[PDB]
């Protein structure tokens, strides 16, 4: 019955400040401490601090002192966390969780994703990846698609309008100088390409763009 509904994703520029919320329901809000946790690939899960809704008393991890500020609104059974002087290092997923003195963090919020960037919304450049000299060895050939320089995530990618689903690998986007870059691989029989056309279809909702890029065999 206990539930923790967190606010949606946040996308801001460095130096800004954000106030995330965690709405508690299904239990007596003032009876348990509310904890906040940061999660990043490089730093794993880090405890930020805790607050006792009963009187607002707070405890902080020295690492986040001055960065996060915990507060609550008793009447609305809501917990809040403000993060200030934001930098790219604050980009992560932040969870609220109900603390039990002896039972640990029994219930967690779904998490709120925070992205702090100097970048602006930008459609990607879609480049074809055709094997060198259009060669191949076995009975298969691998082609690719390079989706470079877009912001923010995500992009949707299919091969031949999705008709080619097997033999496809789309790699996780990687950040680079404020923008994202992603690539996708597709393997077909050599009797399929270049005999038939293979096209990469790429959409970037945030910029309302949709692009199709045909993979052409080429010579020097």
């Amino acid at each position: 019955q206990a539930y923790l509904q967190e606010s949606g994703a946040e996308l801001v520029r460095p130096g800004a400040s954000v106030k995330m919320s965690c709405k508690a329901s299904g239990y007596r809000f003032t009876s348990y401490n509310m904890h906040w946790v940061k999660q990043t690939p490089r730093q794993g899960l880090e405890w930020i601090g805790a607050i006792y809704p009963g009187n607002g008393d707070t405890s902080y991890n020295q690492k986040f002192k001055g960065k996060a500020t915990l507060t609550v609104d008793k009447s609305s059974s809501t917990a809040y966390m403000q993060l200030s002087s934001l930098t790219s290092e604050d980009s992560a997923v932040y969870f609220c969780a109900r603390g039990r003195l002896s039972l640990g963090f029994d219930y967690w919020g779904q998490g709120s994703t925070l992205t702090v960037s100097s970048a602006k919304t930008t459609a990607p450049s879609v480049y074809p990846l055709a094997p060198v000299c259009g060669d191949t060895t076995g009975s298969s050939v691998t082609l690719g698609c390079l989706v470079k320089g877009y912001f923010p995530e995500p992009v949707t990618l299919t091969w031949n309008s999705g008709s080619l689903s097997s033999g496809v690998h789309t790699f996780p986007a990687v950040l680079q100088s404020d923008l994202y870059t992603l690539s996708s691989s597709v393997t077909v029989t050599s009797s399929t390409w270049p005999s038939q056309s293979i096209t990469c279809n790429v959409a970037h909702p945030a910029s309302s763009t949709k692009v199709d890029k045909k993979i052409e065999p080429r010579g020097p």
């Binding site: 405890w47 450049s125 691998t142 690998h169 996780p172 680079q176 691989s185």
Partner: protein, 214 residues
């Protein structure tokens, strides 16, 4: 601060087998430790508390043990649904700290990577750039190393890598490596090579090409 150490970032297993994940606290915390399970894109889920008690609803195949500094989360009759990451946490004293996590992945027979290399496209060159791409597909185990060489010399600046998670169909892994240079930089050299070293072979898998030569 109390440091929680999960020596194993990854552990291989198979459906039906039993696995034990280790976690050690830098100081005595008695039985005040919990274990959480997390699947990609989701929040952690409480599994074990006070070192050995299961939360309500948790499967009986999950058991915890240990007291003091050394702890263990053991999963018996591992199920596909159990494939995820597990973190230990001490909630004895502030600051509360977590372990770095241990990922559970499916065991399978070793597989050599299929390597493909691609030159920068005419489209990108026109925009003053040049990315050389290398795909290392469907290999196992996950550990692999790639090196870029330009005219025989290894190159490290300008390289960006991306790894997929274990494939749900063949339990293999794939990787993409991209070397990005300026157009002028790219046209200053002739030989480009992608080299991968994997457990499956004592010698590197090499894929090369010479600019403007077929």
């Amino acid at each position: 601060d109390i440091v929680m150490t999960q020596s194993q970032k990854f552990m291989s297993t198979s459906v039906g087998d039993r696995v034990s994940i280790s976690c050690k606290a830098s100081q005595n915390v008695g039985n005040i430790i919990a274990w959480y399970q997390q699947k990609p894109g989701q929040s952690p889920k409480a599994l074990i508390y006070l070192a050995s008690y299961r939360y309500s609803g948790v499967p009986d195949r999950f058991t915890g043990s240990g007291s003091g500094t050394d702890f263990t989360l053991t999963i018996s009759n591992v199920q596909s649904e159990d494939l995820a990451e597990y973190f230990c946490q001490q909630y004895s004293s502030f600051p509360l700290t977590f372990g770095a996590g241990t990922k559970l992945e499916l065991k399978r027979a070793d597989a050599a990577p299929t390597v493909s290399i691609f030159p920068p496209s005419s489209e990108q060159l026109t925009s003053g750039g040049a990315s050389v791409v290398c795909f290392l597909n469907n290999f196992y185990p996950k550990d692999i190393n790639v090196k870029w060489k330009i005219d025989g010399s290894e190159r490290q600046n300008g390289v960006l890598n991306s790894w997929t998670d274990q494939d749900s169909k063949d339990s293999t892994y794939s990787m993409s490596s991209t070397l990005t240079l300026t157009k002028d930089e790219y046209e200053r050299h002739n030989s480009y090579t992608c080299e991968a070293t994997h457990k499956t072979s004592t010698s590197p898998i090499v894929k090369s090409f010479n600019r403007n030569e077929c």
